[PDB]
Amino acid sequence: ASLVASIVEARKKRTAKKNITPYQRGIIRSLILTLDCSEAMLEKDLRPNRHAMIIQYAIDFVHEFFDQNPISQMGIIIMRNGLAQLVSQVSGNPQDHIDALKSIRKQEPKGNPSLQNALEMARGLLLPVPAHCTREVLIVFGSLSTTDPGDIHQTIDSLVSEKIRVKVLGLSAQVAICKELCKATNYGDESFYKILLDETHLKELFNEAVTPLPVNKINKGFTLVKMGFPTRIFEDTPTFCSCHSKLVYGGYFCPNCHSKVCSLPTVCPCCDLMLILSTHLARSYHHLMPLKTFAEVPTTEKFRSEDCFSCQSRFPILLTSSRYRCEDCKQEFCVDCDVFIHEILHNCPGCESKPV
Amino acid sequence: LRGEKIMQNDRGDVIIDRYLTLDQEFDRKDDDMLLHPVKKIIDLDGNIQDDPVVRGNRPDFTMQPGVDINGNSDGTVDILKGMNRLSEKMIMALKNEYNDERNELKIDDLNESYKTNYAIIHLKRNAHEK
Amino acid sequence: MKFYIDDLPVLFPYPKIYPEQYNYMCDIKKTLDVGGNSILEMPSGTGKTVSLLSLTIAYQMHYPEHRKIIYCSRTMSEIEKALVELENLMDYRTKELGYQEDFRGLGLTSRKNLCLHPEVSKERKGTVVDEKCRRMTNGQAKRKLEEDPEANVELCEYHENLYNIEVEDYLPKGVFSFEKLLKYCEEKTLCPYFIVRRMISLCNIIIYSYHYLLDPKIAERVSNEVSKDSIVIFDEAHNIDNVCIESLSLDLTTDALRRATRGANALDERISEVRKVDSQKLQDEYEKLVQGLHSADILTDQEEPFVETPVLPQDLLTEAIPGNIRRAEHFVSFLKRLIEYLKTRMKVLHVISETPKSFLQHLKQLTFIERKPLRFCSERLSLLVRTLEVTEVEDFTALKDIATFATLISTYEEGFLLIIEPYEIENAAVPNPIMRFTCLDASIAIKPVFERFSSVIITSGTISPLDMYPRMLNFKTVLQKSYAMTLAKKSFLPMIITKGSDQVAISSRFEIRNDPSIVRNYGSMLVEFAKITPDGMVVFFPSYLYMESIVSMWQTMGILDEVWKHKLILVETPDAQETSLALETYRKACSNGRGAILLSVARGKVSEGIDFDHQYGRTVLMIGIPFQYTESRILKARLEFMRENYRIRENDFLSFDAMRHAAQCLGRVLRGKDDYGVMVLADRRFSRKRSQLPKWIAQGLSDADLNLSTDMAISNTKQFLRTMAQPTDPKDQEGVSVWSYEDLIKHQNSRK
Ligand code: SF4
Ligand SMILES: [Zn+2]
């Protein structure tokens, strides 16, 4: 029964994954990461302290966010002494944000938090953003009280008018404003206010936010974005960079003005034209054509082969069939591949192998 | 101002004490600044005025503000009003220049669960060769 | 949805329905069909008013009888909430049935709550408002104006405008709440008060407070218009006895008697002034009195008696005037001697308790005032006052108290006791003697209600134990039961704290209120809970004085300063307007997210109708058992009367009285099953009171929470708050706590 207990738990876990449909998602994103650094964050519920762990997870989130969203930009804000402090301008450089967070890791948190101040700063920082981008705000709230100079309700209404989206991660309990902020800002959806239940659960919540959020049907904006694909060039002598004005061995050449840049993907400093590589767009393709989840094969029927199609792993004999088939191509797979094919890869080998 | 019972024994300061009477006027002015009609839902004034001819035994001294031997108020009720006024001022300061009852009474949990209105896109795959 | 009962179709105003609501409706229909009284107890976390209205409204519309509905509440604020549910209920019926069925439903309240006159609604007391309204609506001003247009007496445009239109056309068909009624009346310059009074006989459902059904002063006029077979609903009747007792109670002080003599002398002077110039009025009144007519046959419908009948309609004598008080001058002498007799009885040096018969016997000895003439003091005074042209009655106001006292004492003799105390307040430099007429039997004023009406439903959220109420109030019930909420996941955490973090017992005993050890322990509890409470926290104290003293102790100690950092402190005050502002600020603070903590009295104005659903109430801190003041003559006399009559132990009643109030506040935090909160009872005496709590609260109280410490309790609260925050699994409540139409049909099939 112990082995069956694990199997049934896997089925329950697979129950949520069954319902997958290609929802429209905004690949281009503009995130404003807000961290709470107040007296309430000095507690020891999270070892060594809330501030240390949150900063540590923030660095991991930055690494993950830019890895799967190469054509996105992020900004970092912090609440301290009842005021909102800006620590990094919105930019596409992952290193800049990580460096800023590392410096923040030293200063001790103190004072009270001010959501209205943080939201107001986020609203201003997101004002110079193209309409084709999705404006998102990730707030890490730990305090159960908010001290603000003005009316928070007015700011929430302004946030809705600006088509901003807010995600709040709590630490202790539910806050009335956070629920209202996460509800009115997300078309009444109540799934954008999450409270962690332990140290491990917090890691999943940060990882979940990486995936682009689906867009609402009524909030439909379609437009064409002008972009360019620079060609990498190797130079025998170092030359000045158009971005930092420093000696570098070489850089990508913009196809619109021939101005060189250090690293990609970034907007050209001269023609203000977003420069990217073919790989950068390719990564976000899986969010557009998600691989249909595999359905477990009942043991009543007869299996095709005793070994996995993609990894040639003999299926254990052991109650419950250890095989998962793909409806599109009807190819059995072991448990290990399905996790690997839906988390690392995003293409079913069986479907590709089938000729037409 | 700190919401503490003033002690007659305390000497205080002669210069500052001149403004004590002014503060009493300020509190009266502040009381009007906060006074305004209240919704009938949380209107406690009407509860006692619902039957204006109620005649009954007077409440015991435990249900009335404390008084001293002379019969006058001990003054601890004043600090309660002072603290109460201070809280009201802070909230009002937030709402600076910078139907509803029906919705509140309704039970949200009994309503239909929120339904997502996300869009779905199907993309065709066909293009000319290089 | 619209589901069916055995023969009654009912339209629920929500797509879903709780299992308890369906059981609630079925039992209520059984009570109505079988007839008689019933007592029903529901958890506060399930919609009770909406469920009750849906069935009752359907019952009237379906059966040919079309019995009217009477809804009784305990406060005006509750009337507003009930009307909102009716307005929501009618909207659903109109949208589902395709038409607005013929229905009329209006609330009711005093003039002060419905006066629109620019110069009369700005008064701080309802008595003055009634007097001013009477002056412009008695009819003397209208009659005087007709005879002489030059008369400076004014009228009320709102009242006058009503005469143009018929009573049936005062308001359009539908349901009008106070908020909506005022708006409609303002746009047309009409008096909501008079409209409500003149439409009771035509309203399908009438909603008013208990004081309008039990108090003889104001209930007689209203009760005379309602039907005899109408349905009666007692909503939140767990404190009905207190309302019943105060209806037939009175207080007399030395100042009241002192002001009574001045009015009596003024009344005598007025008679002489009228006698010299216009003596025909006295003869006209005297001529009518000889035959045996009373105020009803003399006073017109437009006008009302100056002194409201302090006794029930069934207990007033119908005989003619005895003759002693038949004349104006003679009655004043009768009244004057009575006032002096009361004054000489105010000099006693020790507490005296005597029955009404003993008081009458001593009165008949020292003076020669008989019982029968004393019963018509109030009745005779109204006739004399009316005929004396006393438009200004500022001086004669005090005489109302004397007239009220005479009628009450001379009417009832069993279950009533008279208390004379030489010291109203023991903490006083000079004696301030008071005279109190107390009512001991709690069934006297409610007896007519249970006899006039056939079917009566008594329902409340914390009415337990159910067996005691039939004992206290002499009535029988066909069925009495309490429903337990079938919540899939625990939503409320009731726990009992008996000692502080230092393992020292904590109690709210009055004698040790200024205890340095207990004050710190309670102060630590307040601060620690305020640190973890997300939005709002309500603190209920046994009495205002105990709260007043302890709060001052915290202020000096500095406990409040710590609380100020995390939440705003709102304090209940004796003034009603100031307390209302505090609630608005408290709600506003909770809404935005600043956080606020409200300190109130368990027996105060906040606990008698104000609700703290969802964010407003997240943690309730009951500071001690709300015990009454044991060393009170009024309570002691009541306790002895119950023990001898109903064989109820004094300790048992005292525990029941305190628990009924402690439970009352606990139920004002949950509205639906999506609400959550923690109920902490901070006293060592709560440990043995688990059985006395409401069933739906007792079931949620674990055996391990009977005796907890501050440190242990805080940790449990933190865990509970965190766990409830997680998203609830829909499947865990698809058909176990919440029912859809399909689920309801399935239950109706399995049951049948
Ligand atoms: S008639 Fe109505 S509006 Fe006029 S004074 Fe009386 S209560 Fe007020
Ligand atoms: Zn560079």
Ligand SMILES: [Zn+2]
């Ligand atoms: Zn360029």
Ligand SMILES: [Zn+2]
């Ligand atoms: Zn495999």
Ligand SMILES: [Zn+2]
């Ligand atoms: Zn496949």
